[PDB]
Design a protein around this ligand. Structure first.
Ligand SMILES: Fc1ccc([C@@H]2CCNC[C@H]2COc2ccc3n[nH]cc3c2)cc1
Ligand SMILES: [Mg+2]
Lengths: 63, 617, 339
């Protein structure tokens, strides 16, 4: 608490955190929504899958 | 009937039990009869590093017991040459330079190797003692110690024989301890006869006195090996004396000669010396309280009126009138061992004249005898016998024999005992004058009495077992034979596992056998092997991994309970459930309670500071 | 005072960071995703129930094969399960009963665990004669091990109750890089897919994004009102979700450098123990202390599913890399596979 090097290390870190390039939340949000639509075709939890491709429904034949 | 040792798995519980009492030091295990027998077995047969160190110790002990210099000179040559000199040749003596100096010049006594004894202990007090703890012999020591600390004697542990003594508040039987076959004497006192005469203090005091004296293996005092009680009887397990008392033999044989009395006087003196070295005054020395054994040697018995002047002297007039010293018979006069020497002079006088020295002309009244408080010795007495009796019967304690600073030694040096070698007296080598051939120990001789809980709590700390006495009895009877039967049994258990340890390599605290309770209405007690971990308590079945367990977080309290007069542990679980565990021995019950209490208290305090583990609303 | 100045301009820099963030909140994620269709009712049923652990289950981890998974339990054991057959591949007895976390290497050749022993223990699975020996004991932390994740078979990142994270070299055992910054017990971490970055939640109610190679902290995300117990990266690596004892899950974006969404409800008060995304990131699964696992619409912040099957606290969860199923470990000593 009473350390000067502790205060320096804190300030120089808050400089690294403050001097970054930020984008608009709308830009960051659209990129996330666009990713979910781009891979909604590849998400087994999002879309129902038949018992053949699903190794957990009623398969039991495994390697 | 026979004594049975617990399984080797008992080591895990016993080792922590003894470590919590500092009983796992070299000094405390080496000075025990059974511990020594196991330590030497490890050193002689299982470790060539310590084999010469212990052979040297045993040869010295055999040399200390030697009697004559005719034998001490011949043996001291072999011990010095074979053990000390041979190593100096090959320059490998592991003893201090000065240690050999003291023994070297001393050439042409029994205690010449005492400086070496300390040096041998140093060479064993340490890394040699460490490998013994880790060896299978210390496991066998834990197997025997568990038996010693689980002794709960009852009448059923003995085969009672005929009565060998009546008097006081009970009677004495000859008996045989079934588990080892040792012949003892059972002094069985009726509590109702004790409370009726307000003699609780007397009975309680006798065991306290027996406890102070029953060590060292004294051959001239009726020592105690065990003490237990039933709801109605107080049992003392004492040395067997089936030859009757002197009071009886004094009337059958008659008066004794000076030489026949020199035998009895010599052995009683050594007995008095043993009590006085332990700060115990007998205060009731008379022919009635001196028993004979099968051969004719004598012992001092019945320590009821014995007192302890270790810290503060007594001063009351307690004893049998006609034998009490002037510093005793009067009231308000402090005293110590000085009373027994005057009692000896009064008693020795009776063995010659057939009557008490002051009971003149066979008077009957008690106050006729205590009057003469200052001594006319018959003319037939030898000059040396008078010099002894006059010193023992002096009114003044400053001018009393045996009360001049050196104690019993002053009585040994009397010219009446010039003919005696006191070493041979101690070894019971001198022939007893009277060999007993049976109603030979009687003394000078109502129902509807209450036995409340206040009476049973007076005899609360009465149960006692002398550790030195029990280990000696075991060592001379079944110790060698039981270790062999146990070894053949443990080897079959170990060899069977190949054709057939969960605690190693982990952070296991303690593991052993307990019996959890299933349905109590079915007498369902399942013996499982338990493993205690810092956070859980697991148990397993027959050759199977632990099916279930019990976490330390669940445990709320560890309490001791009774189930069918059997001590069990009561674990209260967080869900209001109960968990009952029966231990196979008292030390297992104690250690499991402490370790479980320590574990759940530590684990609960540790989880409290862990957000991943603690409980949150 | 020089110390009073460095504290003065430190609080003056924090206001600059908040202003820079508020200069980017032109819209909300809820506004952006207001147009897309809801996900409906995600109905998952218990496919497998993994039985074996004797006490509470504290942590789990899937293998990259989306079949094998490792679990750490209060019974001082690691069990590597075959999710397809419910058979135990390995029953590793641990040397310390106080285990808290476990990890499964991407290669599946090594597993790690640790806890109040303050050591990360690396176990080699495929040995010479099919044994499970301890291959390395990474000692260096002064507090309990809270989480650990393999980078490969030679480097691993750990988090501890000493308010630090660490990068280890497995072969040499050295503490290669340390990640100082947190002011409270670090609880969980999650690696970015590219493994140049990782985030970490601590009991200081903050999460930090670290650079593995540079050994520094790039961004610090605040917002939670209680201890952050869980954290997981969004599949595209530009965002991550957290779970806390404040009964909320929150979503943070790295490029916007602020919170985007909060997953809460007045109906829920118990803390979150674990979080994970579906393969596409559209679903956010969180394990709660009320013995339930809730499925959240990551884009619309609406509760879409519930996994009810455990009688005690759901202490950990995880989705297979192929997104086929979701495992749930709980204090009731059971693991259940949901699909
Ligand atoms: F309860 C009793 C029983 C007997 C005696 C007698 C009464 C006569 N004087 C000797 C004593 C001690 O009696 C014996 C008799 C035989 C023994 N063997 N071992 C101890 C023994 C003690 C005293 C109290
Ligand atoms: Mg007196």
């Amino acid at each position: 608490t009473a350390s000067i090097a502790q205060a320096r290390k804190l300030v120089e870190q808050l400089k690294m955190e403050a001097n970054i390039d930020r984008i608009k939340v709308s830009k960051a949000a659209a990129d996330l929504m666009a990713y979910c639509e781009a891979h909604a075709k590849e998400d087994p939890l999002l879309t129902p899958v038949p018992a053949s491709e699903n190794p957990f429904r009623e398969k039991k034949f495994f390697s | 009937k026979k004594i049975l040792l617990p399984e080797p798995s008992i080591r895990s519980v016993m080792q922590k039990y003894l470590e919590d009492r500092g009983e796992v030091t070299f000094e405390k295990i080496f000075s025990q009869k059974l511990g020594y027998l196991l330590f030497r077995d490890f050193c002689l047969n299982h470790l060539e590093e310590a084999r010469p160190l212990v052979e040297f110790y045993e040869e010295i002990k055999k040399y200390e017991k030697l009697e004559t210099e005719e034998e001490r000179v011949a043996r001291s040559r072999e011990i010095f040459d074979s053990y000390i000199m041979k190593e100096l040749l090959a320059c490998s003596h592991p003893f201090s330079k000065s240690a050999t100096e003291h023994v070297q010049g001393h050439l042409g006594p029994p205690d010449l190797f005492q400086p070496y004894i300390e040096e041998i202990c140093q060479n064993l007090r340490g890394d040699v003692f460490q490998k013994f703890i880790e060896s299978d012999k210390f496991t066998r020591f834990c197997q025997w110690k568990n038996v010693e600390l689980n002794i709960h004697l009852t009448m059923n542990d003995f085969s009672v024989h005929r009565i060998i003594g009546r008097g006081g508040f009970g009677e004495v039987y000859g008996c045989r301890k079934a588990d080892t076959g040792k012949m003892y004497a059972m002094k069985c006192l009726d509590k109702k006869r004790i409370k009726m005469k307000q003699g609780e203090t007397l009975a309680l005091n006798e065991r306290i006195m027996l406890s102070l004296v029953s060590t060292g293996d004294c051959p001239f005092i009726v020592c105690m090996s065990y003490a237990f009680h039933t709801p109605d009887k107080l049992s003392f397990i004492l040395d067997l004396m089936n030859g009757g008392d002197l009071h009886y033999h004094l009337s059958q044989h008659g008066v004794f000669s000076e030489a026949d009395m020199r035998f009895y006087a010599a052995e009683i003196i050594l007995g008095l010396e043993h009590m006085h070295n332990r700060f115990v005054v007998y205060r009731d020395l008379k022919p009635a309280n001196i028993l004979l054994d099968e051969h004719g040697h004598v012992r001092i018995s019945d320590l009821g009126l014995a007192c302890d002047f270790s810290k503060k002297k007594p001063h009351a007039s307690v004893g049998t009138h006609g034998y009490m010293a002037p510093e005793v018979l009067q009231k308000g006069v402090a005293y110590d061992s000085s009373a027994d020497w005057f009692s000896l002079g009064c008693m020795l006088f009776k063995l010659l004249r057939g009557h008490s020295p002051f009971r003149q002309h066979k008077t009957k009244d008690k106050h006729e005898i205590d009057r003469m408080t200052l001594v006319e010795l018959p003319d037939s007495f030898s000059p040396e016998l008078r010099s002894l009796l006059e010193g023992l019967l002096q009114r003044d304690v400053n001018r009393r024999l045996g009360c001049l600073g050196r104690g019993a030694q002053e009585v040994k040096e009397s010219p009446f005992f010039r003919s005696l070698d006191w070493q041979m007296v101690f070894l019971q080598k001198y022939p007893p004058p009277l060999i007993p051939p049976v109603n030979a120990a009687d003394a000078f001789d109502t129902k509807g009495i209450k036995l409340l809980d206040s009476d049973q709590e007076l005899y609360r700390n009465f149960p006692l077992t002398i550790s030195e006495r029990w280990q000696q009895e075991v060592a001379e009877t079944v110790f060698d034979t039981i270790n062999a039967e146990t070894d053949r049994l443990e080897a079959r258990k170990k060899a069977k596992n190949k054709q057939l340890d969960y605690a190693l390599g982990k952070d296991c605290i303690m593991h052993g056998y307990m019996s959890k309770m299933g349905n109590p209405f079915l007498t369902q007690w399942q013996r499982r092997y338990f493993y205690l971990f810092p956070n859980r308590l697991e148990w397993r079945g027959e050759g199977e991994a632990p099916q279930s367990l019990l976490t330390m977080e669940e445990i709320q309290s560890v309490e001791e309970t009774q189930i069918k007069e059997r001590k069990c542990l009561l674990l209260k679980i967080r869900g209001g459930k109960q968990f009952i565990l029966q231990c196979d021995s008292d030390p297992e019950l104690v250690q499991w309670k402490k370790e479980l209490r320590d574990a759940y208290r530590e684990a609960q305090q540790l989880v409290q500071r862990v957000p991943k583990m603690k409980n949150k609303p | 005072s020089e110390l009073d100045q460095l504290r003065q301009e430190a609080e003056q820099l924090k206001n600059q960071i908040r202003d820079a963030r508020k200069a980017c909140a032109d819209a909300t994620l809820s506004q952006i995703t207001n147009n897309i269709d809801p996900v409906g009712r995600i109905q998952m049923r218990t496919r497998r129930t993994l039985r074996g652990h004797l006490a509470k289950i504290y942590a789990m981890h899937w293998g990259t094969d989306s079949r094998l998974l490792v679990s750490a339990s209060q019974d001082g054991k690691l069990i590597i399960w075959d999710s397809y057959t419910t058979n135990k591949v390995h029953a590793i007895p641990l040397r310390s009963s106080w285990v808290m976390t476990c990890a499964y290497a991407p290669s599946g050749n090594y597993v790690a665990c640790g806890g109040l022993d303050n050591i990360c223990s690396i176990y080699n699975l495929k040995t010479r004669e099919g044994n499970v020996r301890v291959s390395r004991e990474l000692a260096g932390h002064t507090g309990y091990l809270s989480c650990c994740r393999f980078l490969d078979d030679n480097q691993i990142v750990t988090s501890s109750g000493d308010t630090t994270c660490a990068l280890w070299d497995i072969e040499t055992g050295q503490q290669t890089t340390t990640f100082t910054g947190h002011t409270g017990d670090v609880m969980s971490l999650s690696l970015a897919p590219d493994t140049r970055l990782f985030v970490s939640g601590a009991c200081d109610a903050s999460a930090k994004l670290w650079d593995v190679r540079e050994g520094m902290c790039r961004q610090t995300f605040t917002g939670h009102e209680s201890d952050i117990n869980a954290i997981c990266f969004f599949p595209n690596g530009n965002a991550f979700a957290t779970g806390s004892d404040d009964a909320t899950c929150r979503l943070f974006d790295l490029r916007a450098d602020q919170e985007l969404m909060t997953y809460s409800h007045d109906n829920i008060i118990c803390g979150i123990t674990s979080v994970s995304f579906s393969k596409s990131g559209r679903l956010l699964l969180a394990g709660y202390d009320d013995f339930n696992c809730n499925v959240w619409d990551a884009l619309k912040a609406d509760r879409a599913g519930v996994l009810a099957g455990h009688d005690n606290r759901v202490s950990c969860l995880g989705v297979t890399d192929d997104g086929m199923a979701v495992a749930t470990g709980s204090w009731d000593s059971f693991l259940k596979i949901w699909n």
